[PDB]
RNA sequence: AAAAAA
RNA sequence: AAAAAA
RNA sequence: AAAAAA
């Protein structure tokens, strides 16, 4: 077989090619340490390589109330150990300053050159607000965070310190979330696994994690929801994508999904967690499938019209959207003649469909207009 | 299978990813402690993380009269332990002040800086009045509480202290109910499990819990009562939702229900208890199904017309409501011709249906008018 | 999350 | 060796 | 990477 070469570098056996040792500090005054960590973050301290330990202590305190034995027996740890993480407990008790935990001289002087209004749960749940759209850029991410804060306030669920709502603070949090794997992983793991018993902060994390599913992986939804159509007999390929020119992108896409599947329950977060195989799902690798799948999906989702694509894709996208709207009006019209609708009943449904389509069309246009206005504002 | 990725993060094995240790204080003067707790709540004291212990003592006193052995063998405890709760008994007897139970310096000073008219049963039953509409916002919740108090007074069932009817007090209670899982859980558990022997306070809790079923989960009633129609042969899909455009939302909805089902008897309270999987039932995930299911349901329930939806949904909702009213008039008219109604009997039923529909139409309009007036008042 | 429920 | 790929 | 989601 001569085509196997094309997939040779896509699928490898799991093993460990890296080692990452994280100090786990075991102190009696865990709450005091957590308060110092929050203050250091409010002050804009970059803990660099030591950040994993400080973020871990906030997580350990929040999730296990200092129970280090359970923390290190958790599913999160067992998962991480299989990827080269090593957790070592260091009993550096009696600590009054974070500079006494640090093994990086720049961190030590930043901390040397130093009461807050928050606990670890609030710090972590605030950080989790950045998971949806984390991978869409800092502008989009910050707007999403602001929108969620306003909702949580309206819910009466949680109120964050006003200092944290400043841009300068949110950018510190954004950078920690973009560069620190462990904090993203732990927030996702807890949000996706707690069953009952959530505190206000856990409700926030759980909701934020749910909103991050497939964030940055729209191609996995537009292709699987509209191009590859699963039915009782198998998977049908949508007519606008049955062209030989794009069928190869469809099969290449299936190969990419086959590699993402190795991550199980974390696969929906592959773009946030930079999981292996996510690079096989880039839009540039599937230029016809990307424009077509989004274009047909846009004919159904009136809000999907707000999604931007590059210039290469915009014209094909519109061609696919218009073709899908026409294909569906035909399909809706013929489906009624296979139903036991007599005449009078059928006519009611016809008027419903016409109204439904007009309402959607108007909604779609409104979103297109906003997309253009947003680009004009960025320009 | 390539569509399995879409559900990968929705269903996980139950296990414990958190530990929450709750001190259970064992004192001889349990009634005196309960009175101190009520006074602290009347004073607006925020017990933060210790709130679980104080709320637990009020519950333990009310439900078991101080029998700690039975309390800790209860179904409520066995359930909670499976989610990481740990209950430890601390024999801190001889206590005169709550500051002597507390392990949080802000709580200690608030209590340091300090006779009431109520018992634990009243405190707990008052708090339970906030369960219906707890998740609809503080305005709606407070109005519901006021309406229930007036009813209970008319019933001659229970009279609450006038101080508790102030807004400032009700907001303390609202915040405890919004953020403390354990109190919501315990009120629901008792309300849903007592069979006979209810005191005035238990009658109030039981009624308040019954009214909280599916509070915040209207989508689970409008879809299951009107879109997915169970009959002897299986489940039929309502004509206004047989469009391919929404059939995917219907199947996605079934997947969400499949995850809520893991909670058994507590599933109807998933929005109040923030139970895992409830985030798969959000209206934004099912925009056509949400507007249509509510719209058709509104054609049957004249009071359902008072429910607000966002602007995205309002036009589709009305289109579905009008289509359903027309579909039903046709259905009612034809059904009579399949019944042994001769002529004279059939005509009586026809006039009945016409009157019934006119009465409902007028009632629906009245509710629509109120919905608009309420929005105008909020504006 | 948004309506009714002695 | 020659192009595209958040 | 780009939209919506109490």
Swiss-Prot record, chains A, B:
A Gene Ontology BP annotation from the UniProt entry: viral RNA genome packaging
Location in or out of the cell: Virion; Host cytoplasm
The UniProt record lists the keyword Transcription regulation: no
Segments of this protein annotated with the region NP core: 7-378
Effect of residue 2 to A: More than 90% loss of oligomerization
A GO term, aspect molecular function: RNA binding
Assigned GO CC terms: helical viral capsid; host cell cytoplasm; ribonucleoprotein complex; viral nucleocapsid
Record's signal peptide: none
PTM entry text: Phosphorylated by host.
Record key words, sorted: Acetylation, Capsid protein, Helical capsid protein, Host cytoplasm, Phosphoprotein, Ribonucleoprotein, RNA-binding, Virion
Disulfide bridges in this chain: none
Assembly and interaction partners: Homooligomer. Homomultimerizes to form the nucleocapsid. Binds to viral genomic RNA. Interacts with VP35 and VP30 to form the nucleocapsid. Interacts with host PPP2R5C; this interaction leads to VP30 dephosphorylation and viral transcription. Interacts with VP24; this interaction facilitates nucleocapsid assembly and genome packaging. Interacts with matrix protein VP40; this interaction allows recruitment of the nucleocapsid into progeny virions. Interacts with host STAU1.
Family membership: Belongs to the filoviruses nucleoprotein family.
Function: Oligomerizes into helical capsid to encapsidate the viral genome, protecting it from nucleases and the cellular innate immune response. VP35 binds to and stabilizes monomeric NP, keeping it soluble. Upon virus replication, NP is recruited to bind cooperatively viral genomic RNA and VP35 is released. The encapsidated genomic RNA is termed the nucleocapsid and serves as template for transcription and replication. The nucleocapsid is helical with a pitch of 10.81 NP per turn and a diameter of about 22nm.
Domain commentary: Comprizes a N-terminal arm involved in oligomerization, a NP core region involved in RNA binding, a disordered region follwoed by a C-terminal tail involved in protein-protein interactions. During oligomerization, NP N-terminal arm binds to a neighbor NP thereby displacing VP35 bound to monomeric NP.
Protein name: Nucleoprotein
Organism: Zaire ebolavirus (strain Mayinga-76)
Span covered, complete protein: 20 to 406 of 739
